[PDB]
Symmetry: C3
Subunit: 228 residues, 3 copies
């Protein structure tokens, strides 16, 4: 249900995340390697958070209307940003730990990533049209260089790891590059920006992206000898 029938995607996202979280738990039962276990904890928590936020959005909790100075009324599922505020740093930690990056470097990218999500939230909530696009631009600039440092910095951290770890890192990095880069596009073309698609199309697109960025990513990470 929802405002425009977009609830079907909120329900399926809820289910997709829960099934991924559950697979990950059953797959991690017979691991007691402390470092391997850490990868399971992180990678289970991520779709747990998302499942919870997707369910709250299904029930209408993360949903607010914003009347823009435009007169337009935007149906904002703000609970997304609550989800992303924690899971995108957890995702960055996950791949940082695989790459063997330093704590300096991981914290640097999480700080960058947080700035990306919070300026995206301001873009999403502010009523001043120019500010919405001003902050979407601010946020997209931070994403571009987050992705650059992810490639340049974590890439060089892993450059001295074994070949299985570098290859798992390359796959995970690639999932992030293609999948995360589309989020600002969905915001732009969905109802919070140019409104090229409705709340239904926009919610479907974030569902596909979230499921790939979390369950797809987690599956590839947890199935890789690199973490053993």
């Amino acid at each position: 249900l929802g405002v425009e029938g977009e609830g079907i995607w909120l329900a399926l996202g809820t289910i997709g995340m829960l099934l991924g979280m559950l697979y990950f738990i059953a797959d991690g039962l017979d691991v007691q390697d402390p470092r391997q276990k850490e990868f399971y904890v992180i990678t289970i928590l991520i779709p747990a958070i998302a499942a919870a936020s997707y369910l709250s959005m299904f029930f209408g909790f993360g949903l607010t209307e914003v009347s823009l100075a435009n007169g337009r009324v935007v149906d904002v599922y703000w609970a997304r940003y609550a989800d992303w505020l924690f899971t995108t740093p957890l995702l960055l930690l996950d791949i940082g730990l695989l790459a063997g990056a330093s704590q300096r470097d991981i914290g640097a990218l999480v700080g960058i990533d947080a700035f990306m999500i919070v300026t995206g939230l301001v873009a999403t909530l502010t009523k001043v049209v120019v500010a919405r696009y001003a902050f979407w631009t601010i946020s997209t600039i931070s994403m571009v260089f987050l992705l650059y440092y992810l490639v340049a910095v974590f890439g060089e951290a892993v450059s001295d790891a074994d070949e299985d770890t570098r290859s798992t890192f390359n796959a995970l990095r690639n999932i992030i590059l293609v999948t995360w880069a589309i989020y600002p596009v969905a915001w732009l073309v969905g109802t919070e920006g140019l409104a090229l698609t409705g709340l239904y199309g926009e919610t479907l697109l974030f569902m596909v992206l979230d499921l790939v960025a979390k369950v797809g990513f987690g599956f590839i990470l947890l199935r890789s000898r690199a973490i053993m």
Copy 2:
């Protein structure tokens, strides 16, 4: 004194936390070993935070009305969640340091704890009746993990410590086990859930639990020779 007299518990809550804080400050005046001091810092901050939360609640800040879809109007003190979001990980850090658990395992427990509290916040704030109980169930499920992992994982980390540390950990763990487990019962029987009792009684329940879970917990910890 509040909406339905509960101000008395908020006031006495304030005073007990503040007195607990002041005691802990007084008792750690000439502590200089870094590790012992760490315990004092954590264990002083915990009632500092709760005291501030109770005071804000006493004054009516952090009180909200929530109109449920069934027409019931619930007087929700949401400031508790602000408190718990920070004191419950600090409590977990406090006993994890005692147990000598890895920062992996404390972060793991802190992650489940945060999930517990925020899903509790959603259950308390959402208007949809079924969603309230849905998120109460996800949060209680997370609390069962947390406690299992508290007992299982911190217990094994404290198994190689001296005997005063093991016994101090056992005491503290039992305080968490008993008192923490009653919070979901409190929510369920109080005005946010089945309304078996009213906000006055529900507030009394939480005050008692907070004071045990923080001042009494902190008393047992700081008084122990295991912290030297």
Copy 3:
């Protein structure tokens, strides 16, 4: 431009922060020593955050009305507190890293700093007049501790460092001591407190303080031989 023309300071503050972060970036293009690089990252993020917050206030997001219990209405720029909740701990990390303070010492100061900002936010948002001043007092007391522990505990940690590190620390410490201590005065005299001045003058004062506490501080830190 804003409520009372104070928007001029929000724009100049925006541009001032932006230009400080651009200077810092330009300054650190060829830094590759990790410790040196960490100082740059933190000290770039700080004005980046202040710039985004100032911009959002300029566009009126994070502006809100708070109507007190006595009928007075306060134009509350609450986005300040979102800015301060993150940049004041980063500033503490910066100088605590400079001072070679332990992670225990830094976390302690950051915990006190976080309490200072949140009780400041309560003071600013609460409607009960007595409460605003009670939480301003609470917040200011925490600041006195913070500044004291900064002087004592970071000063003690830097006491073993070389001549340029101590000297750089002293200058940074003194910037913190004089500039930070003026914020509660600004709150007290501005529209949040006694309203001796209005939002215009209040916003000018916070602008000057932020720029000195962030760009000025950043300049002194990043130009110092100590971080080499």
